[PDB]
Design an enzyme around this catalytic site. Structure first.
Site, PDB file in Angstrom:
ATOM      1  N   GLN A 214      34.870   9.423  25.100  1.00 24.33           N
ATOM      2  CA  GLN A 214      35.716   8.577  25.978  1.00 24.33           C
ATOM      3  C   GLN A 214      35.280   7.125  25.806  1.00 24.33           C
ATOM      4  O   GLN A 214      36.112   6.296  25.388  1.00 24.33           O
ATOM      5  CB  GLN A 214      35.585   8.943  27.452  1.00 24.33           C
ATOM      6  CG  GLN A 214      36.880   8.772  28.238  1.00 24.33           C
ATOM      7  CD  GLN A 214      36.726   7.896  29.460  1.00 24.33           C
ATOM      8  OE1 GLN A 214      35.627   7.441  29.794  1.00 24.33           O
ATOM      9  NE2 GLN A 214      37.836   7.652  30.142  1.00 24.33           N
TER      10      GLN A 214
ATOM     11  N   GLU B 275      39.033  16.215  24.732  1.00 21.82           N
ATOM     12  CA  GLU B 275      40.227  15.940  25.577  1.00 21.82           C
ATOM     13  C   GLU B 275      41.125  14.929  24.852  1.00 21.82           C
ATOM     14  O   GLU B 275      40.592  14.039  24.158  1.00 21.82           O
ATOM     15  CB  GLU B 275      39.813  15.447  26.966  1.00 21.82           C
ATOM     16  CG  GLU B 275      39.821  13.928  27.112  1.00 21.82           C
ATOM     17  CD  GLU B 275      38.506  13.313  27.560  1.00 21.82           C
ATOM     18  OE1 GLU B 275      38.544  12.439  28.450  1.00 21.82           O
ATOM     19  OE2 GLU B 275      37.447  13.698  27.021  1.00 21.82           O
TER      20      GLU B 275
ATOM     21  N   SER C 179      29.076   7.465  23.753  1.00 21.34           N
ATOM     22  CA  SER C 179      28.261   7.237  24.973  1.00 21.34           C
ATOM     23  C   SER C 179      26.924   7.955  24.790  1.00 21.34           C
ATOM     24  O   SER C 179      26.766   8.650  23.772  1.00 21.34           O
ATOM     25  CB  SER C 179      28.953   7.733  26.200  1.00 21.34           C
ATOM     26  OG  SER C 179      28.158   8.696  26.876  1.00 21.34           O
TER      27      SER C 179
ATOM     28  N   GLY D 131      29.599  14.190  27.427  1.00 19.96           N
ATOM     29  CA  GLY D 131      29.601  15.480  26.708  1.00 19.96           C
ATOM     30  C   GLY D 131      30.070  15.326  25.275  1.00 19.96           C
ATOM     31  O   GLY D 131      29.346  15.775  24.369  1.00 19.96           O
ATOM     32  N   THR D 132      31.235  14.711  25.070  1.00 15.37           N
ATOM     33  CA  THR D 132      31.765  14.496  23.709  1.00 15.37           C
ATOM     34  C   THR D 132      31.110  13.276  23.125  1.00 15.37           C
ATOM     35  O   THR D 132      31.536  12.841  22.042  1.00 15.37           O
ATOM     36  CB  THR D 132      33.281  14.334  23.754  1.00 15.37           C
ATOM     37  OG1 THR D 132      33.502  12.946  23.979  1.00 15.37           O
ATOM     38  CG2 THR D 132      33.929  15.126  24.873  1.00 15.37           C
TER      39      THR D 132
ATOM     40  N   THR E 188      27.391   6.943  36.685  1.00 15.48           N
ATOM     41  CA  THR E 188      28.598   7.747  36.994  1.00 15.48           C
ATOM     42  C   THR E 188      28.238   9.215  37.175  1.00 15.48           C
ATOM     43  O   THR E 188      27.845   9.583  38.300  1.00 15.48           O
ATOM     44  CB  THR E 188      29.601   7.545  35.862  1.00 15.48           C
ATOM     45  OG1 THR E 188      29.710   6.134  35.712  1.00 15.48           O
ATOM     46  CG2 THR E 188      30.958   8.146  36.171  1.00 15.48           C
TER      47      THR E 188
ATOM     48  N   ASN F  25      25.367  -1.173  30.949  1.00 16.68           N
ATOM     49  CA  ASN F  25      26.671  -1.407  31.630  1.00 16.68           C
ATOM     50  C   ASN F  25      26.399  -2.388  32.768  1.00 16.68           C
ATOM     51  O   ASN F  25      27.162  -3.358  32.914  1.00 16.68           O
ATOM     52  CB  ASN F  25      27.317  -0.099  32.068  1.00 16.68           C
ATOM     53  CG  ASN F  25      28.486   0.274  31.191  1.00 16.68           C
ATOM     54  OD1 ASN F  25      29.124   1.310  31.411  1.00 16.68           O
ATOM     55  ND2 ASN F  25      28.781  -0.548  30.195  1.00 16.68           N
TER      56      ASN F  25
ATOM     57  N   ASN G 289      33.979  -3.909  26.840  1.00 22.88           N
ATOM     58  CA  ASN G 289      34.185  -3.409  25.451  1.00 22.88           C
ATOM     59  C   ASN G 289      34.302  -4.577  24.462  1.00 22.88           C
ATOM     60  O   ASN G 289      33.599  -4.532  23.441  1.00 22.88           O
ATOM     61  CB  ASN G 289      35.367  -2.447  25.403  1.00 22.88           C
ATOM     62  CG  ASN G 289      35.100  -1.172  26.167  1.00 22.88           C
ATOM     63  OD1 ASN G 289      33.942  -0.827  26.420  1.00 22.88           O
ATOM     64  ND2 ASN G 289      36.151  -0.462  26.547  1.00 22.88           N
TER      65      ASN G 289
ATOM     66  N   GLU H   1      19.550  -4.145   4.717  1.00 28.97           N
ATOM     67  CA  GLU H   1      18.498  -5.111   5.118  1.00 28.97           C
ATOM     68  C   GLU H   1      18.287  -5.035   6.635  1.00 28.97           C
ATOM     69  O   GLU H   1      17.200  -5.416   7.099  1.00 28.97           O
ATOM     70  CB  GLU H   1      18.918  -6.524   4.733  1.00 28.97           C
ATOM     71  CG  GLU H   1      19.571  -6.606   3.356  1.00 28.97           C
ATOM     72  CD  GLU H   1      19.979  -8.010   2.949  1.00 28.97           C
ATOM     73  OE1 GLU H   1      21.056  -8.157   2.334  1.00 28.97           O
ATOM     74  OE2 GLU H   1      19.223  -8.957   3.250  1.00 28.97           O
TER      75      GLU H   1
HETATM   76  N1  LIG Z   1      31.239   0.127  28.052  1.00 26.77           N
HETATM   77  C1  LIG Z   1      31.994   1.176  28.359  1.00 26.77           C
HETATM   78  N2  LIG Z   1      31.407   2.344  28.789  1.00 26.77           N
HETATM   79  C2  LIG Z   1      32.167   3.416  29.104  1.00 26.77           C
HETATM   80  C3  LIG Z   1      33.544   3.352  28.996  1.00 26.77           C
HETATM   81  N3  LIG Z   1      34.047   4.545  29.371  1.00 26.77           N
HETATM   82  C4  LIG Z   1      33.020   5.359  29.707  1.00 26.77           C
HETATM   83  N4  LIG Z   1      31.850   4.670  29.551  1.00 26.77           N
HETATM   84  C5  LIG Z   1      30.492   5.183  29.798  1.00 26.77           C
HETATM   85  O1  LIG Z   1      30.400   6.522  29.363  1.00 26.77           O
HETATM   86  C6  LIG Z   1      29.663   7.289  30.288  1.00 26.77           C
HETATM   87  C7  LIG Z   1      30.177   8.721  30.287  1.00 26.77           C
HETATM   88  O2  LIG Z   1      30.346   9.148  28.955  1.00 26.77           O
HETATM   89  P1  LIG Z   1      31.818   9.281  28.325  1.00 26.77           P
HETATM   90  O3  LIG Z   1      31.849   8.828  26.885  1.00 26.77           O
HETATM   91  O4  LIG Z   1      32.777   8.471  29.162  1.00 26.77           O
HETATM   92  O5  LIG Z   1      32.181  10.840  28.480  1.00 26.77           O
HETATM   93  P2  LIG Z   1      32.373  11.827  27.218  1.00 26.77           P
HETATM   94  O6  LIG Z   1      31.378  11.532  26.125  1.00 26.77           O
HETATM   95  O7  LIG Z   1      33.789  11.746  26.714  1.00 26.77           O
HETATM   96  O8  LIG Z   1      32.118  13.302  27.801  1.00 26.77           O
HETATM   97  P3  LIG Z   1      33.155  13.899  28.871  1.00 26.77           P
HETATM   98  O9  LIG Z   1      33.313  12.904  29.992  1.00 26.77           O
HETATM   99  O10 LIG Z   1      32.654  15.215  29.412  1.00 26.77           O
HETATM  100  O11 LIG Z   1      34.485  14.101  28.191  1.00 26.77           O
HETATM  101  C8  LIG Z   1      29.845   6.612  31.630  1.00 26.77           C
HETATM  102  O12 LIG Z   1      28.649   6.644  32.368  1.00 26.77           O
HETATM  103  C9  LIG Z   1      30.203   5.183  31.288  1.00 26.77           C
HETATM  104  O13 LIG Z   1      29.114   4.337  31.564  1.00 26.77           O
HETATM  105  C10 LIG Z   1      34.139   2.178  28.567  1.00 26.77           C
HETATM  106  O14 LIG Z   1      35.359   2.103  28.471  1.00 26.77           O
HETATM  107  N5  LIG Z   1      33.362   1.089  28.245  1.00 26.77           N
HETATM  108 MG   LIG Z   2      35.937  12.603  27.333  1.00 27.36          MG
END
Ligand SMILES: Nc1nc2c(ncn2[C@@H]2O[C@H](COP(=O)(O)OP(=O)(O)OP(=O)(O)O)[C@@H](O)[C@H]2O)c(=O)[nH]1
Ligand SMILES: [Mg+2]
Ligand SMILES: Nc1nc2c(ncn2[C@@H]2O[C@H](COP(=O)(O)OP(=O)(O)O)[C@@H](O)[C@H]2O)c(=O)[nH]1
Lengths: 129, 426, 123, 438, 16
Positions: free
Chosen positions: D11, D71, D140, D144-145, D179, D206, D228, D254
């Site tokens: 995500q 997803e 992230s 999870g993903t 979160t 963040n 972002n 490098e």
């Molecule tokens: N900088 C930034 N961080 C984000 C953003 N969206 C989610 N995050 C961070 O990602 C963390 C959660 O991991 P995600 O990547 O959103 O979730 P995921 O890896 O898709 O795993 P699932 O939620 O189970 O599908 C949160 O604590 C946020 O801090 C974003 O748009 N910008």
């Molecule tokens: Mg996701």
């Protein structure tokens, strides 16, 4: 004509806005607006008589206070779209870009017994026409 | 592309979801003749999640509607959005429930489970990708605890690895309509903890308190009670239907707030609530929504949360809002109420954010919370049970239906066991 | 209270007809509408043919004040809002009024005096 | 020919990338519809459009990256988003269900039902690349993903392409703000499948980016789009040489020869420099001195970790813009006097400077102004330990009461893994304390 | 030759 970033205080509809800088979210959002800020030769200053409206004002000389007193393409959806398109599971005719395309516009010889002696192709000409 | 199934049982469960099915019908903009008249486009790519398609553009509600007595179905089909419901999904008997758990579970219930599982797995197999099994029922009834407990037992043995959440209506402490409420409650609570692994249960009294104090209505009928309990269950699945920047899906909203496998009793709530005459005098701002989310009066609380301690909390949000505020403010809720959030878990609150506001508002949220204070919700039923069991008041009706007393106490022994792990984390 | 006592058992039986031919699949439907004058609520029942393919349920719309245009200045239907020769918008469904009970005719003679009552039945 | 595959998975990643390819396209004058601006020009050379694009026959340049998230919600917003008719119809692999924030759903169950196509496409892309310089991952570290799919790839990838640089762009959990509740778990579990499979970890927070959006760019209440695009620009600044001409040019190789010292110690915190609005911008003198005597300040680090309670080791000072080579020397000379930027005794050199010649680009509608220079102090410090200690300390405080472990070791795993992670992490910490030791 | 921008730039700077 924006608000400078150091400016505290009150600007309308700042609380419901987000994602923009303080000089852009203020500049995007009264007639008398002043916050932003967008004869004297006939009398010598030693005079001590009377002139009306001459006992009131500063920011300018006595010899100036008697001055102011006196004066349809691009409708397709690409590969593997995990959304929903109306009429996607029903009809068909072409590819998934064209499936999503066509689904958007639809959202809104007889008498052969008595044939004796004339050529069979010539017989069907009489039957067809 | 990822679809959900909702289940309706009981007189209370049928009326809530019929009010729930209209809330999304005018959220997704589906006309109450079956066609669709939505304003925007974003409510069409996820319309299969909660509905499904049929010929002529006539959209279909994906629900199953089952009750023993056909009286309430005669009212659902006569309702505002009752001409959309499919009468194949109207499976009914001919006799009443009688407000008892014997003629709902084992004997009357056993000759409808084949008829209902046949139409539930009809749509479940025709589904492209099943996600969940939502069910709305009342614990203190003859059908909601009667047959709403077979289905959740006969789905889990057939779908063992899918999340399924339930929307129970626990009987109120000091106001009731039946005099048989703990018999239909204790015998359900053992079964509800064993296989649902998620609940949503707030009594009828807290709905009255919100409609008297938060919303300030003089004559609240069952309509606004059903609308309000429908609002907290249309925002629980909003990440499956609308985009966002930090969303929480249902299985994602499961491991984040179920710390132990049988510790799954939660506490709903709807954020943007106000009086009818105080709409224009109120700043619909997200720091003020969460002051209202984290109280006992404007949030759906059958029991007072300050009598226990919050173990794990969700906060799913809806609407275009800034992420920095909601991150810093959940930090502010945490440190100001550090005595009311548990230790040994550093992060306690889920922050889920949607992109598209609901109809009639510009931002909204739904409070979803596991409280250890929910132990008092089950004390009063246990305290009512031992005050009526010891005289054997109505054990002859259960004995007459071929049901024994041996596991009649096994239901209470386990909810006394159930609350024991609640009191382990004072 | 004053409207409950004045018009308690005064029910306006308004026969109706509904057509859905713009849809691909539909039949000409004939409806029965009752209008309570006690609290101004409109209740609609359904009468079916001898071998109708529809399930024989009792009611079509329940005992409620029916909204004016479409699905919802909360203005509702009243007795003067509908008559013979007009079409009502019952929850996005265009239903035409065709016939009435003779008691409702005697009701309409006393208040405004509509005469000659040109009913328009379908087939 | 110096192409660069960037695998954005998750995500977050998908977001920190839908706002990264924007500037990755703006700089190289790429139209949000393939066919590039064909009526004027922007000056880029018919070569710079190769580091991240692939000329077809009609100009329909296509992104050289891979966006995988189980997803479909997010990648659906790209399929139907400002940027389309360009992102490869298949470079956007769409999954089915999500991950719930439970590592398992990325390194055991569904985690495997997609790596077969994901890995496939990344290789299908390697073919065209006649010099894949590296694999920059964008996910992230607390989902999870993001930890799941990435971990699976991380190792899987190494066992196929090996010899390469696996620099990673991650959104690590912030100290207080957070979160999901099982973040101190889905995180301590991924620092065990990356510490021996991925090199430099360009980690980002963040809370830090949020405080910088208010203390500098003056945007009280920022969002993810606001965050972002900044993290997105750090990416561009790093991959500058591979595309833009310049004097001293630093490459992806490098970036891991003067940076990561000992094998495991590869945790660098980044620091963009001209983070300023437009009001306080065309007034201040963005001097190579200030743009440097700021990247070394505490409140300007994008990873909450006082850069003072520790000891710097290596420090690349990538310099995009009109940076004459001279000022840089004196700028770093000043840094070496400041008796506060404490250093260890093993790195007498320390700074690698890449004075590329290409001023930054303004993403239409954003806080960043038209500054004519930018620095990205990607540095390995020993205070990034106070970024783990927390996550780690938390793990124990929670694992003690075996919390949220059922739905973990259930979709597929092995309770033991939890314990092993803590061990590997204690080591990372033990080594950091022995690395900064005189 | 030139692109359809230098011809525009030349008719509002040098009056071509
Ligand atoms: N900088 C930034 N961080 C984000 C953003 N969206 C989610 N995050 C961070 O990602 C963390 C959660 O991991 P995600 O990547 O959103 O979730 P995921 O890896 O898709 O795993 P699932 O939620 O189970 O599908 C949160 O604590 C946020 O801090 C974003 O748009 N910008
Ligand atoms: Mg996701
Ligand atoms: N909040 C709410 N509660 C309801 C509604 N309808 C019924 N109930 C509750 O349901 C209880 C009795 O219904 P119940 O016996 O469960 O229906 P049955 O299971 O079909 O027999 C009452 O105590 C009511 O409080 C409703 O529309 N809203």
């Amino acid at each position: 004509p924006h608000y400078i970033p150091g400016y505290t205080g009150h600007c309308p509809l700042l609380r419901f806005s987000m994602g923009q800088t303080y000089g852009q979210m203020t500049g995007q959002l009264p007639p008398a607006h002043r916050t932003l800020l967008p004869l004297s030769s006939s009398m010598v200053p030693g005079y001590t008589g009377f002139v009306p409206q001459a006992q009131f004002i500063f920011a300018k000389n006595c010899s100036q206070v008697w001055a102011e007193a006196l004066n349809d393409p691009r409708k397709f959806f690409m590969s593997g779209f995990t959304g929903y398109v109306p009429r996607a599971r029903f009809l068909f005719g072409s590819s998934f870009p064209v499936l999503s395309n066509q689904a958007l516009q639809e959202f809104g010889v007889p008498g052969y017994k008595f044939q004796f002696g004339r050529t069979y192709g010539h017989l069907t000409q009489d039957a067809l026409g | 592309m990822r679809e959900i199934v909702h289940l309706q049982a009981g007189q209370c469960g049928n009326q809530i979801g019929a009010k729930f099915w209209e809330v999304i019908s005018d959220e997704h903009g589906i006309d109450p003749t079956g066609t669709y008249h939505g304003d925007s486009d974003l409510q069409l790519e996820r319309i299969n999640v909660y509905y499904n398609e049929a010929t002529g553009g006539k959209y279909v509600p994906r629900a199953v509607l089952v009750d023993l007595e056909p009286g309430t179905m005669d009212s659902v089909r006569s309702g505002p959005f009752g001409q959309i419901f499919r009468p194949d999904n109207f499976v009914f008997g001919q006799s009443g429930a009688g407000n008892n758990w014997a003629k709902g579970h084992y004997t009357e219930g056993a000759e409808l489970v084949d008829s209902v599982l046949d139409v539930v797995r009809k749509e479940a197999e025709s589904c492209d990708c099943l996600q969940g099994f939502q069910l709305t029922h009342s614990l203190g009834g003859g059908t909601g605890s009667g047959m709403g407990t077979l289905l959740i037992s006969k789905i889990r043995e057939e779908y063992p690895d899918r999340i399924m959440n339930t929307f129970s209506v626990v009987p109120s402490p000091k106001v009731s309509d039946t005099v048989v409420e703990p018999y239909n409650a204790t015998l359900s609570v053992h079964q509800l903890v064993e296989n649902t692994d998620e609940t949503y249960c707030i009594d009828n009294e807290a709905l009255y308190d919100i409609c008297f104090r938060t919303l300030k209505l003089t004559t609240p009928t069952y309509g606004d009670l059903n609308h309000l309990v429908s609002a907290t269950m249309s925002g629980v699945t909003t990440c499956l239907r609308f985009p966002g920047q930090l969303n929480a899906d249902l299985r994602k909203l499961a491991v984040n707030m179920v710390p132990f496998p049988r510790l799954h009793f939660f506490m709903p709530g709807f954020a943007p609530l106000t009086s009818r005459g105080s709409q224009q005098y109120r700043a619909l701002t997200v720091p003020e929504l969460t002051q209202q989310m984290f109280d006992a009066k404007n949030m759906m609380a059958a029991c007072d949360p300050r009598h226990g301690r919050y173990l794990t909390v969700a906060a799913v949000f809806r609407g275009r809002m800034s992420m920095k505020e909601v991150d810093e403010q959940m930090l502010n809720v945490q440190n100001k109420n550090s005595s009311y959030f548990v230790e040994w878990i550093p992060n306690n609150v889920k922050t889920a954010v949607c992109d598209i506001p609901p109809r009639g508002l510009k931002m909204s949220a739904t409070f979803i919370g596991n409280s250890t204070a929910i132990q008092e919700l089950f004390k009063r039923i246990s305290e009512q049970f031992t005050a009526m069991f010891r005289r054997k008041a109505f054990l002859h009706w259960y004995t007459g239906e071929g049901m024994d007393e041996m596991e009649f106490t096994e239901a209470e022994s386990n909810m006394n066991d159930l609350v024991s792990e609640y009191q382990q984390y004072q | 209270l004053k409207q409950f006592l004045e018009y308690d058992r005064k029910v306006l039986r308004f026969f109706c007809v509904w057509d859905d031919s713009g849809s691909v699949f539909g039949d000409r439907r004939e409806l029965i509408l009752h209008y309570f004058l006690s609290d101004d609520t409109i209740e609609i029942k359904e009468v079916l043919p001898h071998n109708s393919g529809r399930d024989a349920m009792s009611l079509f719309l329940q005992r409620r004040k029916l909204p004016k245009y479409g699905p919802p200045d909360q203005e509702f239907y009243k007795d003067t809002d509908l008559s013979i020769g007009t079409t009502i918008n019952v929850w996005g469904r265009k239903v035409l009024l065709c016939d009435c009970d003779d008691f409702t005719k005697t009701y309409y003679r006393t208040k405004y005096g509509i005469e000659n009552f040109t009913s328009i039945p379908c087939k | 020919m110096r192409e660069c595959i960037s695998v954005h998975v998750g995500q977050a990643g998908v977001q920190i990338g839908n706002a990264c390819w924007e500037l990755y396209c703006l700089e190289h004058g790429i139209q949000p519809d393939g066919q590039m601006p064909s009526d004027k020009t922007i000056g880029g050379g018919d070569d710079s459009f190769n580091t991240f694009f692939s000329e077809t026959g009609a100009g329909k340049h296509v992104p050289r990256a891979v966006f995988v998230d189980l997803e479909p919600t997010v990648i659906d917003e790209v399929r139907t988003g400002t940027y389309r008719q360009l992102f490869h119809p298949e470079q956007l692999i769409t999954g089915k269900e999500d991950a719930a924030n439970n590592y398992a759903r990325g390194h055991y169950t569904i985690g495997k039902e997609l790596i077969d196509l994901v890995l496939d496409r990344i290789r299908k892309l390697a073919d065209q690349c006649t010099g894949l310089q590296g694999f920059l991952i964008f996910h992230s570290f607390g989902g999870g993903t993001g930890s799941g799919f990435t971990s699976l790839l991380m190792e899987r990838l190494s066992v196929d392409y090996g010899k390469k640089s696996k620099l990673e762009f991650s959104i690590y959990p912030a100290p207080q703000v957070s979160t999901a509740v099982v973040e101190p778990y889905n995180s301590i579990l991924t620092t065990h499948t990356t510490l021996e499979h991925s090199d430099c970890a360009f980690m980002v927070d963040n809370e830090a980016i949020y405080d910088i959006c208010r203390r500098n760019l003056d945007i009280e209440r920022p969002t993810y789009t606001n965050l972002n695009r900044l993290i997105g620009q750090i990416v561009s600044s790093i991959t500058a040489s591979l595309r833009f001409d310049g004097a001293l040019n630093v490459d992806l190789t490098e970036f891991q020869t003067n940076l990561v010292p000992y094998p495991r110690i590869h945790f660098p915190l980044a620091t963009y420099a001209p983070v300023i609005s437009a009001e306080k911008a065309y007034h201040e003198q963005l001097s190579v001195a200030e743009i440097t005597n700021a990247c070394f300040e505490p409140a300007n680090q994008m990873v909450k970790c006082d850069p003072r309670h520790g000891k710097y080791m290596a420090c690349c000072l990538l310099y995009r813009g009109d940076v004459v080579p001279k000022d840089v020397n004196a700028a770093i000379a000043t840094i070496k006097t400041k008796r506060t930027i404490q250093f260890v005794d093993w790195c007498p050199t320390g700074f690698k400077v890449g004075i590329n010649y290409q001023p930054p680009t303004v993403v239409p509608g954003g806080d960043l102004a038209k500054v004519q220079r930018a620095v990205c102090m990607l540095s390995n410090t020993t205070a990034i330990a106070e970024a783990w200690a927390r996550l780690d300390h938390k793990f124990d405080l929670m694992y003690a009461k075996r919390a949220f472990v059922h739905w973990y070791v259930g979709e597929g795993m092995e309770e033991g893994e939890f314990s092993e992670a803590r061990e590997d992490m204690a080591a990372l910490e033990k080594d950091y304390e022995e690395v900064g030791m005189d | 030759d030139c692109d359809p921008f230098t011809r525009q730039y030349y008719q509002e700077k040098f009056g071509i």
